[PDB]
Ligand binder design. Structure first.
Ligand code: ATP
Ligand code: ATP
Ligand code: CA
Lengths: 300, 299
């Protein structure tokens, strides 16, 4: 294999907890031999086939195999991998700027021009993944972090490749996962999956970024899932009164059930709201404001 | 109808009995009577987008269901308290632990004794289905024993968080439950009804007799694929001693089409559960279930 069969603490000073998940716990760490800081993701290994605790080795191996391929300014980087009896430790690029949303919710003002630039960083990272036929499958606010939040315009880093999967043509992939608020119809309906699900998720994230409201979120999970499969949502003037038709058009073409009619990552990159084809479109975007009030309300 | 009062004014809260993603169960004793119960604290969800706690409407719905059910094989609701953060379900105390843990330490086990426990489960499910209540979370860890310390333990079905009342002509669809035990209609996101409970019964029986699991793959993805394809077998390695009637019982439960699947009444009427003659009963009496594989899987 490739996993270092050594004590990670022999080589890293283990620091304070960054965050935790279902089967992983992530901590700051410093490599003794270089003094360089990283994030150590301790993934609990699954002990038996019929256990809901931890992660089976093959899937961990899958996450690593994917991480080793990815080198891009908007994606986290893999440094090394260790393993003992209980855990597999992913040594990852440390992202210290927290989440993007928490940063935006901190903001005094924010135009669509500023918004689309953050969104383009995300598109840039997703474009690179899709090029290598990699589906993230876990695109959601908390997996969108910032390297350094103490600069005027922070850099985005996509994390958490636990659900990432390489798409092979002819090889049907179906599975049930992800947070209901952000999953595409083909996930809910347990239908063939591909690169398009990422694009739907981008639509949802954009909807929220601009309005503070969530397109399909119901009072209960049953409703959310029903909303998703009916593609039932609206641009409530209460929240969208200042949002530009271009933004709405961008969102509309993402939140589409038929996977084939949904915008690709390249088409998203080339959408006028992201890449204006003239002066006029640029000014409009520059004149549209994000609903920071409602956004703060929902994410506070 | 939730008492807006401190549970602790009316109960002595004892040791923690168990815990899940949303609740923590503790032993308790009512002061006025000195009777013991299990106090299940459910954290109320605070925001629609939050993944923590449970929506209050859903908790209200579970209680609405619990209040209706009185049956020896179903847990009994005693009372409901509520404070800032938690809804506290005061439930019948069950002290015998989980059925499987008890089987896993049993010396010997025949099919007769197995159908005895399965019968109790069917009785409890039948009562529910008569009132149109689908459990939707039938799995080993929700099959508890009242006593543990007797020749034949009494089964109590617990955990009604996913329970739902099936309304005629009102489609119900949702994603939930443990993959190993969910029906194809759940995986496929299709109309849900009383049939899902029956599929789960089949899986539980399959495990009980062989120690093996019918659709369990190396990953959740495979398990789901196995379920929707209804791809399983009776591996001789594990089913060598299993009676034909037993396999027929399971075979009629693990069926994709919800209209073909055995109903609870048909399950109670199956010859493996309710033999039609002396001959059938003997075959079940001499049918020994090897506990070896079961213990390997559940110790
Ligand atoms: N490189 C990193 N730097 C700082 N914090 C991180 C880093 N990677 C992950 N985290 C923390 O862990 C979370 C990311 O999820 P993680 O990669 O732990 O997935 P997981 O726990 O294996 O599965 P899931 O979290 O999806 O249930 C983030 O919320 C973040 O707070
Ligand atoms: N009535 C009871 N009497 C004694 N112990 C109980 C009782 N109910 C639950 N417990 C203990 O708590 C554990 C979990 O109970 P239960 O399965 O109802 O909740 P959960 O599965 O943790 O949460 P969820 O409702 O989200 O599934 C059980 O395994 C059991 O050990
Ligand atoms: Ca379907």
């Amino acid at each position: 294999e490739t996993f270092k069969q050594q004590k990670v603490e022999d080589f890293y000073d283990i620091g304070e907890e960054l965050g935790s998940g279902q089967f992983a716990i992530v901590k700051k760490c410093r490599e003794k031999s270089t003094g360089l800081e990283y994030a150590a993701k301790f993934i609990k290994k699954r002990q038996s086939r019929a256990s809901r605790r931890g992660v089976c080795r093959e899937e961990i191996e899958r996450e690593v195999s994917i991480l080793r391929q990815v080198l891009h300014p908007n994606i986290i980087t893999l440094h090394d991998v260790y393993e003992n009896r209980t855990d597999v430790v992913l040594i990852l690029e440390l992202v210290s700027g927290g989440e993007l949303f928490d940063f935006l919710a901190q903001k005094e003002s924010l135009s669509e021009e500023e918004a689309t630039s953050f969104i383009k960083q995300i598109l840039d990272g997703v474009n690179y993944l899709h090029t290598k036929k990699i589906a993230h499958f876990d695109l959601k606010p908390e997996n969108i972090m910032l390297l350094d939040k103490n600069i005027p315009i922070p850099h985005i880093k996509l994390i958490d490749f636990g659900l990432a999967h390489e798409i092979e043509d002819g090889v049907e992939f179906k599975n049930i996962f992800g947070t209901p608020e952000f999953v595409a119809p083909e996930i809910v309906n347990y239908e063939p999956l591909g690169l398009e699900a990422d694009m739907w998720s981008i639509g949802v994230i954009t909807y929220i970024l601009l309005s503070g409201a969530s397109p399909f979120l119901g009072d209960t999970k049953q409703e959310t899932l029903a909303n998703i499969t009916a593609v039932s949502y609206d641009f409530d003037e209460e929240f969208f009164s200042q949002t530009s038709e271009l933004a709405k058009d961008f969102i509309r073409k993402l939140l589409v059930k038929e996977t084939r009619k949904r915008l690709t990552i390249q088409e998203a990159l080339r959408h006028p709201w992201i890449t204006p084809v003239d002066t006029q479109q640029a000014m409009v975007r520059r004149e549209s404001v994000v609903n920071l009030e409602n956004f703060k309300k929902q994410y506070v």
